[PDB]
């Protein structure tokens, strides 16, 4: 029948491909730091790997917190308001400035965290140097995230791609200058990767500020002309809308850290295969998270037009595109399950164990698109808190216990890490059932409370 489904699908492939390119650039920014410090030593590679493992969960909190700012400016721009957007954007910038402080303190406590994991003194000092270098980058990253939330909300995902790509291609020379002490810069070494990431983040922030000021496309909003004074009432309002979608992004990462802790007794050739499979699944997850963000933008815009049916159609085409791309990338994992496992490592025992685990990772990838797209879909509906309840009670209550029961115990022959992955499937499923049934209730509720909650 198609009708409007093909039209909405095409408008969703665009506005989401640039987001995918931006996300691959963001991950490559850390990949380059790791693979370029490995050309100096192995200590400097492990240091900038542990520092990244401590840096990602901390900054994901604020990154999630600003995804409440995204559909707020999406809804206003959709209705035709476009004159209270500047106030909200300025208040969000101040909110990013404020939320930078706790993250900076937590990263300042890095030296204590790296004692509870048996890190030698050389790796510890290199990790602390990296963290104390990227602390200066933290506020610029949060401000850039807020600014890209403004531009994304107006359905303009192109700039963050370019400024993203220019970032990645500017990390290659700046790393080289500082790690190897060229062009008069000090020979920082492996620590130089952090002091180059800080510079590239400030450069990206400056470039995005420049684009918003001139643009000629966003010139109608005139964001940086009035400089609205801070208001604590709104600042609290925009924190209660973003905290639930940051708690979930924190708890997912903590769940996987805990599973890494629990699978450690199973050996050392099993944890390596586990982390290989998990790392590949992380990129295949980068694939449908881009669809979810675009769906959130589209449903926010359509609720602004007071088009409930249009919002529903956009959500459904997003939930279909996610499943289709998930099937495509799951089949390519099942076929090329050995070549991908040979890019990571050269231990054939590890490549065999990871070739077996990348068979459950395929079903994992198929379920972790119906989860993510649905989570993004109702986030546009301003149903933040619901996420935090259904995602949490499905992740921690289900997956971690059934992972332990079907894994290291036999209260059901104990299975290996292929039991933890089965628990992951059991959690991601029924996460994609609670988050999928909440959406169905929302899409069929009174045609008025939908819009009213869409303003909440």
């Amino acid at each position: 029948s198609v009708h409007r489904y093909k039209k909405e699908a095409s408008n969703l492939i665009k506005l989401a491909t640039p987001v995918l390119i931006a996300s691959v650039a963001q991950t490559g920014m850390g990949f380059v730091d790791t693979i370029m410090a490995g050309g100096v030593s192995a200590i400097d590679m492990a240091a900038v790997s542990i520092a990244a493992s401590i840096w990602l969960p901390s900054i994901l909190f604020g990154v999630g917190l600003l995804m409440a700012l995204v559909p707020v400016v999406a809804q206003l721009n959709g209705a035709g308001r476009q004159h209270k957007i500047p106030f909200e954007v300025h208040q969000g910038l101040i909110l990013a400035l404020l939320v930078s402080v706790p993250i900076i303190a937590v990263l300042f406590q890095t030296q204590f965290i790296i004692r509870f994991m048996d890190v030698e003194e050389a790796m510890a000092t290199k990790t602390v140097g990296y963290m104390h270098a990227v602390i200066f980058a933290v506020p610029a990253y949060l401000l850039f995230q807020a600014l890209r939330s403004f531009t994304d909300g107006m359905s303009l995902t192109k700039p963050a791609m370019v400024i993203g790509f220019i970032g990645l291609l500017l990390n290659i020379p700046l790393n080289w200058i500082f790690v190897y002490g060229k062009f008069g810069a000090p020979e920082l070494g492996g620590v130089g990767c952090g002091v180059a990431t800080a510079i590239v983040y400030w450069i990206m922030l400056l470039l995005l500020l420049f684009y918003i000021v001139t643009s000629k496309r966003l010139a109608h909003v005139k964001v940086f002309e009035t400089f609205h004074k801070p208001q604590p009432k709104e600042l609290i309002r925009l924190f209660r809308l973003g905290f639930p979608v940051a708690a979930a992004l924190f708890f997912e990462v903590t769940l996987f850290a805990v599973v890494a802790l629990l699978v450690a007794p199973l050996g050392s050739t099993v944890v390596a295969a586990h982390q290989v499979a998990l790392n590949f699944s992380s990129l295949v997850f980068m694939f449908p998270m881009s669809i979810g963000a675009a769906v959130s933008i589209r449903v926010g815009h359509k609720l602004g037009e007071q088009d409930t049916k249009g919002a529903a159609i956009a959500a459904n085409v997003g939930l279909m595109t996610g499943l289709a791309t998930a099937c495509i990338t799951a089949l390519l994992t099942v076929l090329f399950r050995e070549q991908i496992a040979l890019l990571y490592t050269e231990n054939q025992v590890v490549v065999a164990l990871a070739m077996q685990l990348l068979l459950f990772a395929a079903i994992y990838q198929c379920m972790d698109a119906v989860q993510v797209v649905a989570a993004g879909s109702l986030r546009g509906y301003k149903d933040m808190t619901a996420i935090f309840h259904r995602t949490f009670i499905s992740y921690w209550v289900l997956g971690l216990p059934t992972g332990y029961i079907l894994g290291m115990t036999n209260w059901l022959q104990p299975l290996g890490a292929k039991g933890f992955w089965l628990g992951f499937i059991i959690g991601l499923s029924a996460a994609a059932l609670m988050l999928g049934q909440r959406l169905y209730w929302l899409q069929k509720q009174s045609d008025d409370v939908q819009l009213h909650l869409a303003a909440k």
Epitope: G39, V40, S53, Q275
Partner: nanobody, 122 residues
């Protein structure tokens, strides 16, 4: 044992030169750093030389000017050239390799070697 295979050794007269080699398999070896450790009877295992991923040499104290470590990446080998060997150098030399097991791991992994005997005397 399997990851690292040492090769070389034998009876070297004092003042002679020897060239030990260490072949690595199952290791990325482009990001793993290598080293050589001697262990004579009565004494404790100690380092002799070590090279990083960037080719930085870190010879021991009473090894300077006598031992030169080299490394190849096309064929995964670590060479140790010993010159002006004295009767105090007789020991079993072990090839140690530490570095990330894969591109997704965080903590580095260490692999030892079986070791090759080296006896210096008339």
């Amino acid at each position: 044992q399997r990851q690292l295979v040492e090769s070389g050794g034998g009876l070297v007269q004092p003042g002679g030169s020897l060239r030990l080699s260490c072949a690595a398999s199952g290791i990325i070896f482009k990001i793993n750093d290598m080293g050589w450790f001697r262990q004579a009877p009565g004494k404790e295992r100690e380092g002799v030389a070590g090279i990083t991923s960037g080719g930085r040499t870190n010879y021991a104290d009473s090894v300077k000017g006598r031992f030169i470590i080299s490394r190849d990446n096309v064929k995964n080998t670590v060479y140790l050239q010993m010159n002006s060997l004295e009767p105090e150098d007789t020991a079993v030399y072990y090839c140690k390799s530490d570095g990330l097991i894969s591109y997704a791991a965080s903590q580095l992994s260490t692999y030892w070697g079986k070791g090759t005997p080296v006896t210096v005397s008339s």
